[PDB]
A paper describes a structure:
Interestingly, when preparing the sample of [name] S/hACE2 and [name]-20-52 S/hACE2 complexes, only part of the S1 subunit complexed with hACE2 was observed, indicating an unexpected dissociation. In Patch 1, N487 of [name]-RBD forms an H-bond with Q24 of hACE2, whereas K417 of [name]-RBD forms a salt bridge with D30 of hACE2. Two conformations of hACE2 H34 were observed, forming an H-bond with Y453 and S494 of [name]-RBD, respectively. The F486 forms a hydrophobic patch with F28, L79, M82, and Y83 of hACE2, whereas the shorter side chain of L486 only interacts with M82 and L79. Thus, when the RBD carries H498 and Y501 at the same time, these interactions are saturated and can only be formed with either H498 or Y501, but not with both simultaneously. Thus, the [name] (H498/Y501), [name]-H498Q (Q498/Y501), and [name]-Y501N (H498/N501) demonstrated comparable affinities with hACE2. The SPR results show that [name]-RBD binds to hACE2 with a comparable affinity to [name]-[name]-2 PT-RBD with the dissociation constant (KD) of 21.67 nM vs 18.16 nM, whereas [name]-20-52-RBD demonstrates 4.3-fold higher affinity than the PT (4.19 nM vs 18.16 nM).
Animal coronaviruses (CoVs) [name] (formerly named [name]) and [name]-20-52 are phylogenetically closely related to [name] ([name]-[name]-2), and [name] is the first observed animal betaCoV carrying naturally occurring Y501 in its receptor-binding domain (RBD) of the spike (S) protein, a residue related to human adaptation and broader host range. The S protein sequences of both [name] and [name]-20-52 are closely related to [name]-[name]-2 PT S protein and share high AA identity (97.96% and 98.43%, respectively). Determination and analysis of cryo-EM structures of their S proteins and RBD/hACE2 complexes revealed that Y501 shows a synergetic effect with R498 and inter-replaceability with H498 for hACE2 binding.
Author numbering:
A (entry chain A): 19 to 130, 148 to 613
B (entry chain B): 336 to 528
């Protein structure tokens, strides 16, 4: 009767009580989201507070077991997940102040321009919106962030962590397993190596976009300089998709869009979801349950009932899976349905694992699994052998170039942005950048990594990074980088099992049970095994890699290299509009 | 032969306090039970079910309880798990049959049916066909529990939660096990030869 058996009994009882309370809370939340009434809000609050109190008491109990006398890895992982103190290490006043700061930042951000920045071609109007938003948000969020940083560093140091950035990197850490270890500081090296491999493609894409924007906005862009921040199609420049109207290679050929075929064949939400189910069954994965069809809502209730329209996939425990989405008959809803059903399938994979181990291997696998399904379902061959597109649609290389550029403007154009933001936050938390040198160094990293210049000078009173939703509301942001690699990391691994015989962007993994089994072997694991082993079970490598992305985007790379002969590739940091 | 009070009964007991009913001095029509397409599982181990209508026994017993759906596999000789260890244990050399059918519409309420209980902790595995209804508080480690549960002291009987929205593996299942006893005393249960 050592610590091992006591820990096992404790985990059994915790699993039972936690599963009960979690199902109750999830049912309350679903009832509130389907129908919006005050009573539903009250029930949601009651269930949530009960669940939170139970978790706090259980963590306090679980801190007893020293964790050094445990030889089994599963028990050690569950207890380590349960023993995390969190923000309880602080005093009462400090915790109250931190909560107040977080709440006031959230409220001040929410109650403050997404059409003046997406559908406008006026330079002055966009500059006005940019400067007004930053001046009337960051200049108010700055001191709150200044106190937030120090309080969160105190919390992290009290938990035997160097800083709060290390607290964030702790997700990817694997220890105790020979050959699959992963330190917290190796993530920086991996990210930097990957970005150094990425850079030239971004340089060529940047040159192409700059050349097109010179035509779009005369007498405002230098052929050797940078791109101003307010011309990027978004309020922040996170994505470059809205520029597609100005940077289309061949605008005389319309892109593929099969909404009209859906309307002419009398399609509906039910047909969309049965098509997705048939796709997943053809791959090899198990079919869906009757509860999914009965208990889930796939259309808009109407006007008597108000519901949140955000498409979500719910796993409520006790074998309960459902989807909340207001499905219109279009092509975007088709891909969104595929994405969310992929989420549901991933959730169903690890239903046999213990409660604390029912999640992805790390914070970047759910989205990757959904995205690869959507990419495989959006291919022209699939649309031909689904019945929408005509069964004589000989493609033309111009259409593939258009599709690749559309994908690039959303995928490649965001990696430098996320890398810069995460690195800036890491250095701020480390204390490398002093307070008075924050913003200036920020813009430095904008001119050396992503290549974006400030239209108007910014003093130290401003706080531009705080203007973004993730920074203000305390969310990790590296999740959007690693996923973007894992996605392609998976795809080329599944195309080879599917015996693909062409370019990677024309890959469809339907009617291939080997790819399904290869995916399902990783899916069933959950969080039980290190993410290195889970990645190796699919791709044969234990580390994050970039080459599949270049293999996917090679045709665009060679076309851009051929096109950019008479233009300049690269940028200089000396140029400034002001 | 009283199979109506065994199968079509209003109330079924918890798994820890499973009911035994002794069936004697009747003529048994097992065809009327086999030809029913309402049973999720009907598995006979010692003898073939088709010949259940042409044999004579002495002291057939009917054991009834309610469990989950994925725990039905544990009702078989040589199986392991919480139900097969602490709640209901069958001998390795077991002659008889097991019948199990879904009861979601009867035994699931909207807010939750917490009447059904199962034993979670015990010191030792049960011998076959042994029942305990005790409620002493389990002693996890080495410290006097002294009655009321404390730091390491767990109440051994937990409650099944049944909602009508649960999955098939978590929906209520009613289970009846027929055990055939064959010794040299005069037969009391026979089929219509
Ligand atoms: C909210 O809508 C659900 C159906 O979506 C309905 O059953 C429920 O009665 C509604 N709430 C109230 C308070 O009527
Ligand atoms: C850890 O405990 C589980 C629970 O049964 C067991 O299956 C596994 O073999 C154990 N790991 C060991 C002994 O290394
Ligand atoms: C949590 O806090 C308690 C005291 O408040 C401390 O003994 C324990 O070591 C802490 N846990 C961790 C993981 O730091
Ligand atoms: C679910 O999938 C199974 C396995 O392919 C199939 O036999 C069954 O017909 C499907 N159920 C449907 C499509 O309702
Ligand atoms: C997969 O196989 C089925 C079998 O008939 C076929 O109808 C279908 O066109 C194939 N391809 C896809 C993408 O389903
Ligand atoms: C597309 O193919 C045609 C003929 O194969 C060729 O003339 C044209 O240059 C190609 N366009 C590209 C590669 O963008
Ligand atoms: C239980 O009732 C149904 C109909 O109510 C009947 O068909 C069935 O035979 C009954 N069960 C037994 C064991 O007779
Ligand atoms: Zn996703």
């Amino acid at each position: 009767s050592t610590i091992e058996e006591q820990a096992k009994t404790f985990l059994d009882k915790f699993n039972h009580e936690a599963e009960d309370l979690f199902y109750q809370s999830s049912l309350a939340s679903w009832n509130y989201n389907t129908n919006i009434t005050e009573e539903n809000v009250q029930n949601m609050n009651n269930a949530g507070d009960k669940w939170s109190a139970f978790l706090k008491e259980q963590s306090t109990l679980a801190q007893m077991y020293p964790l050094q006398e445990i030889q089994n890895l599963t028990v050690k992982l569950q207890l380590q997940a349960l023993q995390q103190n969190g923000s309880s290490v602080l005093s009462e006043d400090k915790s109250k102040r931190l909560n107040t700061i977080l709440n006031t930042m959230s409220t001040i951000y929410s109650t403050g321009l997404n059409e003046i920045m997406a559908n406008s071609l006026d330079y002055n109007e966009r500059l006005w919106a940019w400067e007004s938003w930053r001046s009337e948000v960051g200049k108010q969020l700055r001191p709150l962030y200044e106190e937030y940083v120090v309080l969160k560093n105190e919390m992290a140091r009290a938990n035997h962590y160097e800083d709060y950035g290390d607290y964030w990197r702790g997700d990817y850490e694997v220890n105790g397993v020979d050959g699959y270890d992963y330190s917290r500081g190796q993530l920086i090296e991996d990210v930097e190596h990957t970005f150094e491999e990425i850079k030239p493609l971004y340089e060529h894409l940047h040159a192409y976009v700059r050349a097109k924007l010179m035509n779009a906005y005369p007498s405002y862009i230098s052929p050797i300089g940078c791109l101003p921040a307010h011309l990027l199609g978004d309020m922040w420049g996170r994505f470059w998709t809205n520029l597609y109207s100005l940077t289309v290679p061949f605008g005389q050929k319309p892109n593929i869009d099969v909404t009209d075929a859906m309307v002419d064949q009398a399609w509906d939400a039910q047909r969309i979801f049965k098509e997705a189910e048939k796709f997943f069954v053809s791959v090899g994965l198990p079919n869906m349950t009757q509860g999914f069809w009965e208990n889930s809502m796939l259309t808009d209730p109407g006007n008597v009932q108000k519901a949140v329209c955000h498409p979500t996939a719910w796993d409520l425990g006790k074998g309960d899976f459902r989807i909340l989405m207001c499905t219109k008959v279009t092509m975007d809803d088709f891909l969104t349905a595929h994405h969310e059903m992929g989420h549901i399938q991933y959730d169903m994979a690890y239903a046999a694992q213990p409660f604390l181990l029912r999640n992805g291997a790390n914070e970047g696998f759910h989205e990757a699994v959904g995205e690869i399904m959507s990419l495989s379902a959006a291919t022209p061959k699939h649309l031909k052998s689904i019945g929408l597109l005509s069964p004589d649609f000989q493609e033309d290389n111009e259409t593939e170039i258009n599709f690749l550029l559309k994908q690039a403007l959303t995928i490649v154009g965001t990696l430098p942005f996320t890398y810069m933001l995460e690195k800036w936050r890491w250095m701020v938390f480390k204390g490398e950048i002093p307070k008075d040198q924050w913003m200036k160094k920020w813009w430095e990293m904008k001119r050396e990594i992503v290549g974006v210049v400030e239209p108007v000078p910014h003093d130290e009173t401003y706080c531009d990074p705080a203007s973004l939703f993730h920074v203000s509301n305390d969310y990790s942001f590296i999740r959007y980088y690693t996923r973007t690699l894992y996605q392609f990391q998976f795809q080329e691994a599944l195309c080879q099992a599917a015996k693909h015989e062409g370019p990677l962007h024309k890959c469809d993994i339907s009617n291939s049970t080997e790819a399904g089994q290869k995916l399902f072997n990783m899916l069933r694991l959950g969080k039980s095994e290190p993410w290195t082993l889970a990645l190796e079970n699919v791709v044969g490598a234990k580390n994050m890699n970039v080459r599949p992305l270049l293999n996917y985007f090679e045709p665009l790379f060679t076309w851009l290299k051929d096109q950019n002969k008479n233009s300049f590739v690269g940028w200089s940091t000396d140029w400034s509009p002001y | 032969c009283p199979f109506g009070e065994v199968f079509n009964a209003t109330r079924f007991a918890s798994v820890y306090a499973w009911n035994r009913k002794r069936i004697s001095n009747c003529v048994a029509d097992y065809s009327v039970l086999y030809n029913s397409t309402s049973f999720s599982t009907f598995k006979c181990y010692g003898v073939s079910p088709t010949k259940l209508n042409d044999l004579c026994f002495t002291n057939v017993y009917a054991d009834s309880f309610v469990i989950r759906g994925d725990e039905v596999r544990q009702i078989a000789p040589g199986q392991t798990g919480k139900i097969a260890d602490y709640n209901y244990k069958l001998p390795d050399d077991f002659t008889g049959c097991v019948i199990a059918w879904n009861s979601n519409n009867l035994d699931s309420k909207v807010g939750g049916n917490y009447n059904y209980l199962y034993r979670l902790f015990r010191k030792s595995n049960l011998k076959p066909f042994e029942r305990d209804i005790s409620t002493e508080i389990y002693q996890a480690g080495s410290t006097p529990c002294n009655g009321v549960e404390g730091l390491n002291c767990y109440f051994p009987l937990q409650s099944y939660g049944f909602h009508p929205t649960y999955g098939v593996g978590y929906q209520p299942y009613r289970v009846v096990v027929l055990s055939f006893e064959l010794l040299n005393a005069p037969a009391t249960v026979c089929g219509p030869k």
